[PDB]
């Protein structure tokens, strides 16, 4: 549906030491218009992994509805086994890939953070079925904006902490709010570790407009 389906915006995530942090904007975007200023685009899967998506918000809720059952399917068993982020990344890949074979794929972009087996497993899928693993992920215009900020610090600081993570993300969402038309100052800073998913509330960015007065 090429109609104004309420598309999403750039979603960012990066690994830190023994954990993964994922950030996203709370602004639902209707076409070129910004309509919904408060939406929850991030779902928590058990304590182990957390998911977020870009593009169509409606197609996310269906997967949020389907995967919501898929995760409960294990709790329906009660056999003493769990789902790893690799298993969900696997399943979601095959699930998203089987849609385009019928020429009715879900139009969107998704990001999977997670932690399994003493390691933080980050993963990424795509509308077209592209799936891989990277230490940092950038979607939408984050690849055009936030990604070079990540690729610079990753080689400089392979080990990342929460303070280093946030400061990046805080400066990323700061630059994103400047250079993106469909972005908004409200965003979700969400973290996932071995202790479970914890999502911070709405936050803003610091603005330095001094370059404006220096025009004249």
């Amino acid at each position: 549906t090429q109609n104004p389906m309420v598309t999403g915006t750039s979603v960012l995530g990066l690994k830190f030491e023994g954990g993964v942090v994922i950030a996203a904007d709370m602004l639902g975007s209707y076409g070129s218009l910004a309509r919904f200023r408060n939406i929850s685009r991030i779902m928590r899967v058990n304590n182990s992994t957390m998911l977020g998506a870009s593009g169509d918000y409606a197609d996310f809720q269906y997967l949020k509805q389907v995967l919501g059952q898929m995760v409960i399917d294990e709790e329906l068993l009660g056999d003493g086994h769990s789902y790893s982020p690799k298993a969900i990344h696997s399943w979601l890949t095959r699930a998203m890939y089987s849609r385009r074979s019928k020429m009715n794929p879900l139009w969107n972009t998704m990001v999977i953070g997670g932690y399994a087996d003493g390691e933080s497993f980050l993963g990424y899928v795509d509308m077209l079925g592209v799936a891989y693993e990277a230490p940092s992920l950038a979607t939408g215009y984050g690849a055009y904006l936030a990604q070079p900020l990540l690729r610079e610090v990753l080689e400089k600081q392979p080990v990342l902490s929460q303070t280093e993570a946030r400061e990046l993300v805080e400066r990323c969402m700061r630059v994103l709010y400047y250079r993106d038309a469909r972005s908004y100052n409200r965003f979700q800073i969400a973290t996932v570790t071995e202790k479970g998913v914890e999502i911070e509330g709405p936050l803003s960015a610091e603005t330095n407009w001094d370059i404006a007065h220096m025009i004249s």
């Binding site: 509805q65 389907v66 919501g68 059952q69 409960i72 399917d73 709790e75 329906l76 068993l77 009660g78």
Partner: protein
């Protein structure tokens, strides 16, 4: 004169023997009981270990129907393992279609409709199983139902299934299960099961219990061994 050769035929007395014979398989099945309380519902199972080769957790009659719903059965042990998926169908579909948790009555309806579906024909046989279903809700609370092999649903303050029913039921009618808490009665529930037990055929067994209620905040859970040992070792004091 062969009136009962199939369930599709009514006897001259009007009584269907095949569905009744299917109940006789339940009447010979092992006895398990569960009772709702104000805080929630408790489930129990008496498992018969014939040989030492059986591992702990084997032959588990405690079933997980849904997040807030467990299950306990009496009959052929492979029967409800089909109904387990069927119960998960309504559990998944309702949460998929209507987007929230299913009440116990709506689940006990369509399942009882599916139990009665096989009593009709001559080309299928009715369920040789009988089970009870409890749950807990915020707007409703602890409810207790039971479905016989014929597919009948009744509301219950308490119920019993398996070999000896009125052996437990009359004792459950003597002791008031109404305003008591499941945490206090879980000790006495084992005592009732030990009273149902007798050593002629059966020799040794073990107790299997489950959690749903306010103690679990409505989400069906499983009891740990030590907390059950608190009831077990206390039931050993009441064993005599």
């Amino acid at each position: 004169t062969g009136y009962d050769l199939s369930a599709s035929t009514f006897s001259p007395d009007g009584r269907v023997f095949q569905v009744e014979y299917a109940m006789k398989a339940v009447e010979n099945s092992s006895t398990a009981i569960g009772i709702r309380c104000k805080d929630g519902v408790v489930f129990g199972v008496e498992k018969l270990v014939l040989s030492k080769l059986y591992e702990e957790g084997s032959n588990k009659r405690l079933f997980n129907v849904d997040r807030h719903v467990g299950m306990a059965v009496a009959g052929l042990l492979a029967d409800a393992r089909s109904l387990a998926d069927i119960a998960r169908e309504e559990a998944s579909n309702f949460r998929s279609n209507f987007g929230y948790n299913i009440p116990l009555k709506h689940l006990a309806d369509r399942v009882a409709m599916y139990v009665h579906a096989y009593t009709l024909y001559s080309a299928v046989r009715p369920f040789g199983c009988s089970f009870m279903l409890g749950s807990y809700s915020v707007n409703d609370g602890a409810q207790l139902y039971m479905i016989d092999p014929s597919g009948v649903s009744y509301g219950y303050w308490g119920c019993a299934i398996g070999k000896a029913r009125q052996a437990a039921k009359t004792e459950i009618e003597k002791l008031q299960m109404k305003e008591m808490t499941c945490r206090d009665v879980v000790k006495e529930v084992a005592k009732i099961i030990y009273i149902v037990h007798d050593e002629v055929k059966d020799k040794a067994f073990e107790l299997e219990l489950s959690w749903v209620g306010e103690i679990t905040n409505g989400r069906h859970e499983i009891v740990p061994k030590d907390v059950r040992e608190e009831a077990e070792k206390y039931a050993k004091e009441s064993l005599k």
